[PDB]
């Protein structure tokens, strides 16, 4: 027959028949390069620490998204409250220098 045993970094010891015990420790030979392109980085570190990689990736994605949204909201608010006070006020002309610096 054949048996599959999972051995971690701490080690595994098995005794077969009347033989002396032997010990084996697992190395971090995950597939993919931990030193190359980002997708290889991701797959290697996933195969090493799956939950940690998923957590850090969700964290970085949330960090970029929430904060791109913040910058967009800030610039939009600045745009509106900058063109409202007198530029939106009618019967008036707004100079090009003070218009196109943030217009469009």
């Amino acid at each position: 027959t054949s048996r599959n045993f999972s051995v971690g970094r701490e080690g595994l010891e098995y005794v077969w028949g009347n033989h002396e015990p032997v010990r084996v420790w697992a190395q971090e030979s995950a597939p993919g390069d931990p030193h190359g392109w980002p997708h290889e980085i991701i797959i290697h570190y996933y195969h090493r620490h799956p939950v940690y990689t998923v957590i850090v990736l969700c964290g970085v994605a949330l960090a970029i998204l929430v904060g791109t949204a913040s910058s967009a909201a800030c610039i939009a608010k600045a745009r509106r409250d900058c063109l409202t006070p007198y530029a939106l006020a009618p019967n008036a002309t707004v100079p090009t220098a003070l218009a196109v610096l943030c217009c469009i």
């Binding site: 010990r23 190395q27 971090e28 190359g36 409250d81």
Partner: protein
């Protein structure tokens, strides 16, 4: 003088530390846990084995009655029957037709072969730890044993080693343990004096040769039916045999941390867990004045290639220049890279190759050759062998466990995500004060 260190409790992997004093050449320090023992204080409760019932010859009276007496033998049972009229080879043995009274006895005793096949019940207190080190300093080697308590000065000759308290208190034995033919089982045996028939400890005594055996095996005596003399009886199954059949697996194969259970006295050997805060008092004789030791004018390190494997899967070399010759110590000032050599000869100009090991994908540690710290950096690839037969020599870190490129990617992403918000903030505030000053 005094050095405080924290060596991991792994039996066999060396530990390298560098100790130095002003005006004195640095000295290599090597600590090894050669062997460890975990001896708990034990108290013997009783001794049990497979009982052997003894049925004495019946006593009968032709025309009369008998009264059951009290005896000190284990599980003594007595019964009296009213009419028997017994027979043997030769015919009837009494003249009364119905006034024949028969008395039956049955007690238990240790089987003759119990001197070899017998179990011992034990109670174990707090476990104590004792280790044997192989401290190496200078060009000398010392061996010594000490107790890991924080107060015992276990010293070979003048080492004055004080091993502090263990980081975590762990003991593979529960409160109650059972020993049988060198195999140690974690069992909850019944307390002395309270024996349940058909289970472990149905018969117990303070010693195999004690005369005060006590037992409770649920002996039942029955009314004789056949004509010839007989003592019918029924009894529970031997609880010792039942426990032997349902033993389970021993501590030699259940205990964690790779402990090796052994007996006489009961103990656990070569367990791997926690850390030991040692403290060494090195005699001043070993230390050598800095003026005598050769000095390095310059040193540059270059590393060939590296894999963060458990073994010494790494290489390193360095150029050096010195005004003298002698022996100098080499040390790696990092917690994720350990050298193999402790000292190495030096001859003016030349180059020395040193092997190391690491568990990080960056050989970005500091190497000193009797001083003169130097910076190495390499491109550590992962190893190819999935499985190795040697424990890891360095605990995995985190801050160093991540590659430089991945660190750069995450840093750049977070930096942009933190920069766009602040630039939006500042433009917002400048426009807001502009608008406030508008009117």
């Amino acid at each position: 003088f005094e050095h405080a260190t924290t060596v991991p409790n792994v039996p066999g992997i060396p530990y390298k530390a560098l100790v130095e004093r002003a005006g004195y050449a640095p000295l290599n320090l090597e600590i090894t846990v050669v062997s460890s023992e975990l001896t708990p204080s034990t108290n013997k409760e009783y001794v049990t084995c497979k009982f052997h019932t003894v049925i004495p010859s019946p006593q009968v009276k032709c025309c009369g009655s008998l009264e059951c007496k009290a005896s000190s033998k284990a599980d003594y049972t007595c019964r009296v029957f009213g009419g028997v009229y017994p027979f043997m080879w030769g015919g009837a043995q009494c003249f009364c037709d119905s006034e024949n009274t028969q008395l039956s006895e049955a007690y238990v005793e240790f089987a003759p072969d119990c001197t070899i096949d017998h179990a011992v019940a034990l109670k174990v207190h707090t476990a104590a730890l004792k280790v044997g080190l192989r401290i190496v300093y200078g060009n000398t080697t010392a061996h010594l044993d000490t107790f890991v308590n924080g107060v015992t000065p276990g010293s070979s000759r003048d080492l004055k080693v004080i091993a502090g308290p263990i980081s975590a208190a762990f003991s593979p034995f529960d409160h109650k343990v059972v020993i049988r033919k060198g195999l140690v089982y974690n069992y909850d045996f019944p307390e002395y004096g309270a024996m349940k028939p058909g289970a472990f400890g149905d018969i117990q005594a303070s010693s195999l040769y004690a005369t005060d055996i006590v037992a409770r095996t649920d002996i039942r005596l029955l009314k004789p039916s056949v004509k010839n003399i007989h003592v019918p009886y029924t009894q529970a199954v031997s609880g010792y045999e039942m426990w032997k059949n349902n033993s389970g697996r021993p501590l030699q194969e259940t205990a964690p941390f790779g402990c090796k259970i052994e007996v006489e006295p009961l103990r656990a050997s070569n367990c791997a867990y926690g850390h030991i805060p040692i403290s060494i008092d090195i005699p001043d004789a070993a230390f050598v004045r800095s003026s005598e030791s050769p000095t390095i004018l310059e040193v540059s390190c270059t590393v060939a290639d590296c894999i963060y494997s458990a073994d010494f899967g790494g290489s390193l070399t360095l150029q050096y220049k010195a005004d003298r010759e002698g022996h100098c110590p080499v040390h790696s000032h990092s917690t994720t890279a350990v050298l193999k050599e402790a000292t190495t000869h030096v001859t003016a100009t030349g180059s020395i190759t040193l092997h190391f090991s690491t568990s990080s994908p960056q050989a970005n540690f500091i190497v000193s050759l009797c001083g003169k710290k130097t910076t190495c950096n390499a491109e550590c690839k992962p190893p190819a062998d999935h499985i190795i037969g040697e424990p890891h020599k360095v605990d995995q870190e985190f801050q160093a466990a991540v590659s430089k490129t991945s660190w750069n990617w995450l840093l750049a992403l977070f930096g942009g995500a933190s920069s766009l918000i602040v630039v939006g903030l500042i433009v917002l505030v400048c426009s807001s004060m502009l608008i406030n000053t508008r009117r």
